[PDB]
Amino acid sequence: DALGTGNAQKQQDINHLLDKIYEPTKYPDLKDIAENFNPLGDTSIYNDHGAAVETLMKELNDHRLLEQRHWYSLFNTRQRKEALMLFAVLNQCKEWYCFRSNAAYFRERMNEGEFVYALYVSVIHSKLGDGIVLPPLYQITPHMFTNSEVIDKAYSAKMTQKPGTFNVSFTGTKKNREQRVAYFGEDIGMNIHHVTWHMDFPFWWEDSYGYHLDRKGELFFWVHHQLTARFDFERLSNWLDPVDELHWDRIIREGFAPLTSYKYGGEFPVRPDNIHFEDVDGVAHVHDLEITESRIHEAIDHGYITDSDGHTIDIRQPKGIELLGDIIESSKYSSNVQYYGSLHNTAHVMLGRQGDPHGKFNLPPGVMEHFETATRDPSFFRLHKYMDNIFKKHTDSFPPYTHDNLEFSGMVVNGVAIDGELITFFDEFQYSLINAVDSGENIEDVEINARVHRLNHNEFTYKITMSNNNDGERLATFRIFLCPIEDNNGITLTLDEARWFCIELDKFFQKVPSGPETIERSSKDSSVTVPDMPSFQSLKEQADNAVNGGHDLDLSAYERSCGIPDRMLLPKSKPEGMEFNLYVAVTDGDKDTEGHHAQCGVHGEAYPDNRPLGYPLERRIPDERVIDGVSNIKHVVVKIVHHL
Amino acid sequence: DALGTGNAQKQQDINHLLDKIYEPTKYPDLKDIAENFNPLGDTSIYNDHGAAVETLMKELNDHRLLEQRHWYSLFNTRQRKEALMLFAVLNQCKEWYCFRSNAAYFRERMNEGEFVYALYVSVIHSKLGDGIVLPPLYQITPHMFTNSEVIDKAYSAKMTQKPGTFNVSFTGTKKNREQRVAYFGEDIGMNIHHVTWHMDFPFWWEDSYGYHLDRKGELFFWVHHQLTARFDFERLSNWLDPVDELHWDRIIREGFAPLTSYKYGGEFPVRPDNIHFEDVDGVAHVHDLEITESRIHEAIDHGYITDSDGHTIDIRQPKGIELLGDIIESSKYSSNVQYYGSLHNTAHVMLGRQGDPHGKFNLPPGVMEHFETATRDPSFFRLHKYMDNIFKKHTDSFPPYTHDNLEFSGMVVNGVAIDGELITFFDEFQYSLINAVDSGENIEDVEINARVHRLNHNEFTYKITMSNNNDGERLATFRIFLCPIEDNNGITLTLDEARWFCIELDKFFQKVPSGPETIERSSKDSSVTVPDMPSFQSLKEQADNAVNGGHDLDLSAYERSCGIPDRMLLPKSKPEGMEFNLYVAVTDGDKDTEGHHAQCGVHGEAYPDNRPLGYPLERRIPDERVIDGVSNIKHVVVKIVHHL
Ligand SMILES: *[C@H]1O[C@H](CO)[C@@H](O[C@@H]2O[C@H](CO)[C@@H](O)[C@H](O)[C@H]2NC(C)=O)[C@H](O)[C@H]1NC(C)=O
Numbered sequence A, B: 001d002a003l004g005t006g007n008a009q010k011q012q013d014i015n016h017l018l019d020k021i022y023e024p025t026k027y028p029d030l031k032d033i034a035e036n037f038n039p040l041g042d043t044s045i046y047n048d049h050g051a052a053v054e055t056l057m058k059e060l061n062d063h064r065l066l067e068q069r070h071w072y073s074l075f076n077t078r079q080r081k082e083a084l085m086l087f088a089v090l091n092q093c094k095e096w097y098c099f100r101s102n103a104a105y106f107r108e109r110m111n112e113g114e115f116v117y118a119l120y121v122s123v124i125h126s127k128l129g130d131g132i133v134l135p136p137l138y139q140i141t142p143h144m145f146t147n148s149e150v151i152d153k154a155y156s157a158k159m160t161q162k163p164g165t166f167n168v169s170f171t172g173t174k175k176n177r178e179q180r181v182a183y184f185g186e187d188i189g190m191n192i193h194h195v196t197w198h199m200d201f202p203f204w205w206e207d208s209y210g211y212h213l214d215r216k217g218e219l220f221f222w223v224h225h226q227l228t229a230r231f232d233f234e235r236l237s238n239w240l241d242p243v244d245e246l247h248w249d250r251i252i253r254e255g256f257a258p259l260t261s262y263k264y265g266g267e268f269p270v271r272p273d274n275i276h277f278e279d280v281d282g283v284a285h286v287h288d289l290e291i292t293e294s295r296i297h298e299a300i301d302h303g304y305i306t307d308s309d310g311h312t313i314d315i316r317q318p319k320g321i322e323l324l325g326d327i328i329e330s331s332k333y334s335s336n337v338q339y340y341g342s343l344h345n346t347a348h349v350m351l352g353r354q355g356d357p358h359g360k361f362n363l364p365p366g367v368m369e370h371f372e373t374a375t376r377d378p379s380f381f382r383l384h385k386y387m388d389n390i391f392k393k394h395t396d397s398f399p400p401y402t403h404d405n406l407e408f409s410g411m412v413v414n415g416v417a418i419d420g421e422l423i424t425f426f427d428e429f430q431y432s433l434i435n436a437v438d439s440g441e442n443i444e445d446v447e448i449n450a451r452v453h454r455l456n457h458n459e460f461t462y463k464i465t466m467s468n469n470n471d472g473e474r475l476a477t478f479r480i481f482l483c484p485i486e487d488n489n490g491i492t493l494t495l496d497e498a499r500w501f502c503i504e505l506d507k508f509f510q511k512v513p514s515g516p517e518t519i520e521r522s523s524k525d526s527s528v529t530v531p532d533m534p535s536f537q538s539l540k541e542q543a544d545n546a547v548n549g550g551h552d553l554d555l556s557a558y559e560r561s562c563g564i565p566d567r568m569l570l571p572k573s574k575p576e577g578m579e580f581n582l583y584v585a586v587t588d589g590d591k592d593t594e595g596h597h598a599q600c601g602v603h604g605e606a607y608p609d610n611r612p613l614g615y616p617l618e619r620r621i622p623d624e625r626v627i628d629g630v631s632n633i634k635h636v637v638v639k640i641v642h643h644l
């Protein structure tokens, strides 16, 4: 601080705080704070009169909080509770003086993951964290994102003090599996979004924390339907077939070995292939799921969710799908959590100890019991294919849309063109292995680096040619889906068979002139995308330079970023090329935003589009006859090519 | 050398050679040799005219030998072949000039395990290696013997250059398993013997190498029957029940996670528990065993082994049990290896990839596919219980022994006493983690250490009181077994039910006076035991000091050591105490040694006792009525106590 603000301050403070995190801090101010401060002497800084502080001390006192240098999953009901207590202090600070103090005081005696986890969520949601950009998880705690080999290579770099970057690998016996569609799950970008997505709208949020995240519920429905489609496409491009939905009565056919290791903790357990699910002590019974899944499935089938009193709360209406998501992921918006439980989240802990359900070996938690690591394990997508059609069951009970339904009279797409080429290839990225190796003191830092291989495509532009027959200027929702065309059996599906498989590429609002415009728009301005983020270091360099320099840091570019990696914008496809189908449906802006970032409504911000999500492909479309004769929907085929 | 010998030379040379083994040598002479030498320019040093050298070069040339810094199991038919080529050069050296040369030349471009493995066997069997003591595997390549945690702790010591010893753990969730009888399998001593035992008498030996190991065949029968008994006792002392024999048609009920890691290689794969055996690609089919086991079992049942011609070679006679061992472990003394295959050894590779039989994950080999590590995994003893009663099937087909049979007329044991207490406790040991961490150069060595917890007992003495009624002085075999008494069901077995479960404590030859002697003998002089061995370092200190000093190193104390750890002499038992049964049978020395160390006949030396092995408890003993009425057999009960 400046006995306050700056941001190149707030910012600095943060970088110091998550610097070498597996070891006591080396920045002196952080330490006399660390020593000298007492979160309990001027309950005033606190808008709670410090009930939150007072609760953590209580526990840090009876020393009943998890130990340092030990692992942590966010699926542990206690670890979570402890991590979230830090969030509630940092939360009720009136100003930087209370935050730095506490994340310093605490940083130094609470465990690292509870700490990493609390500092981030807090920075993301609390009032006080505007100016900041968080360093990328992959560089702050590299063990969750780099391999096991590169990690050991970095440990040696360090033992010997000779530096250098190592090239990472990809998982199983490439050319032996479906560690062929690996590039997708294993990417530090998607892994970043996956974790952020759930830090932006956490399953544990209560509206006591301050505001209400708006439609987490549909937002949950949708985000995962997207990774499940996005995933299903990559498997198309690899001669692989759409994924199996998981069942509790069957073998988990496809198991994997992650080759990843914890920092403190041991290597991630592995799963043998063609295994039978076991009842995992502590978490829940396998049948416990099977009944949960039926209570679920009866709410969809009935038309109503029934709460605790036996009140039936109707869901055959638009808020529908969000009360279903509150009961299915199970977040605290659940109406009856004692009855519908928690399919999704239990299903994550349940798939993770398949390595050790009675816990005879005391293996650590597993790749699925963590967000920066689940997309690694193949059953991750088998498990969301199953959540995915629990939702479609509801999703599909609506009656199809009428002509009169999709029509935004006046507007009509004339043509759709791609100004450029759809070309995807494989780039190269480098993140840093330093917070991973321990350097104590008087020993100096050798710069170790990891180099990964990630997908990419080339910027391209949309030229959407189109006339407003209306008398004059109307607001427009430009919706753009890229659905597939044939099967992988070769078969050629139907906009019913394929409406569900399509992934959203862009959604934006523009005004339309009163006559033939020709809107053009960029790979680069997509609304579902996010650039790669600034390096850890680089945000140190920068933070530092505006401290000794006066003031700024306006890199607002990054204080939310909900989306997926720009690199992942289009699917991989084949080197021969495939022709996908592009759908531009343009709906009516005035009714869409008929009421209101608002992209990552991280802080209470009402999501702006009111149409439900996947509009208008979210509904059974039995006769294509129709999508086809509304002026404001047009489809054109595109073709993507893969450079070797 | 001294352009030869010494031993504090030969010795020095060796310590230099296995010093930091995961990195090019730092001892300069070793390097100009390494560079300058040509194993192919004075084929003269070679008793082969250097066909052996000439064969390794050939391969090192086409560079078709395994790479350095990669793993190695002795179960790999190629890795083995490559490791054993080094043995054949080092083997045909006329003097040190040829050995050092080669293990220097080679050390530097052949892989480490092939190298570690060749240098040891070579030192053990070749003519030229008399004076030496080998450093203990546990300190030369610590990754095979220390845990995964201590290993990582040592890696950190090194990163930061701050030293120190870490205390090791024990395996699963002690108080949750049968990682309660862990102290036994996991001991660096037994693991040492297990590997030595099979380096002393290797499965691959051909008598072209020079001499014939004498009864490896019975020697195999017996060594394993011993670990299987010794193991079965420890499980008695832990309220556990004797072990299950393994079958190929059933689930492997008891699986474990080893928590151990390779140096170059990844962590040891784990095994889930209640798994079904899969056909493992590359090694052999599961049924391939099931038939092997029948071809085996029919030789026992028939009375003959049938070779390649269809010759039936009889085995219902004393050489019996050794031709059976040649066919069962399958070593090269097999008469028909194309028919009886290799149950034992395949059974080791077969249990190891249970982690990955089609090899979709490319996990490394597993704890059972290695001798310094098999005793770790629980199916290790399930698998030797099954080999164990294949042998008993044959073992038991003989007719029981007659009175007239065991009687060594003249002698009679009067009494048997234990001068002291049978007390076993848990000591503490420290071996060194240095060859484990890499230190390159100009970086200096910090002394890292591992501390383990191992069993122990207290010296005690035998006072065997006994009269030679014979006219005068007769030679005697003093045989001493410690069999159990009751069940663990509480039941109280029979010297038929328990003859097989007893472990040998001592076997020695002494002359008996012509009248009442009273022989007393020590925990310490046992013939089946070996002291802990000298430290790595310590043999460096010592080697070095007699180099700059003139000459010696007579520590012959250690140039073979076949036995088990003195610490493991008696079983653990209970803290309440158990009464075991002690059997001293004294047979007739003149007929025993009716013909000839001779303990570890490492070099061709005829085993000296002629009685078969386990004499006289190796045969069905249907009426105890008999063992009981031969003067020279007496049994007394003892009682062992466990200090907490
Ligand atoms: C990892 O792959 C990279 C590709 O980035 C390789 O790094 C290259 O090193 C080679 C040496 O053969 C150079 O010719 C390239 O210019 C390098 N590129 C950067 C296009 O360094 C690297 O060889 C791989 N392996 C290590 C077996 O780093």
Ligand SMILES: *[C@H]1O[C@H](CO)[C@@H](O[C@@H]2O[C@H](CO)[C@@H](O)[C@H](O)[C@H]2NC(C)=O)[C@H](O)[C@H]1NC(C)=O
Pocket (backbone or CB within 6 Å): B165, B166, B167, B428, B451
């Ligand atoms: C490992 O166990 C050893 C037992 O050898 C412990 O080392 C002891 O350190 C304590 C400190 O509490 C001393 O009181 C003992 O004198 C030590 N003995 C050697 C009988 O050092 C050690 O505490 C354990 N843990 C580390 C949690 O080393």
Ligand SMILES: [Cu+2]
Pocket (backbone or CB within 6 Å): B194, B198
């Ligand atoms: Cu063995």
Ligand SMILES: [Cu+2]
Pocket (backbone or CB within 6 Å): B344, B348, B384
């Ligand atoms: Cu064996």
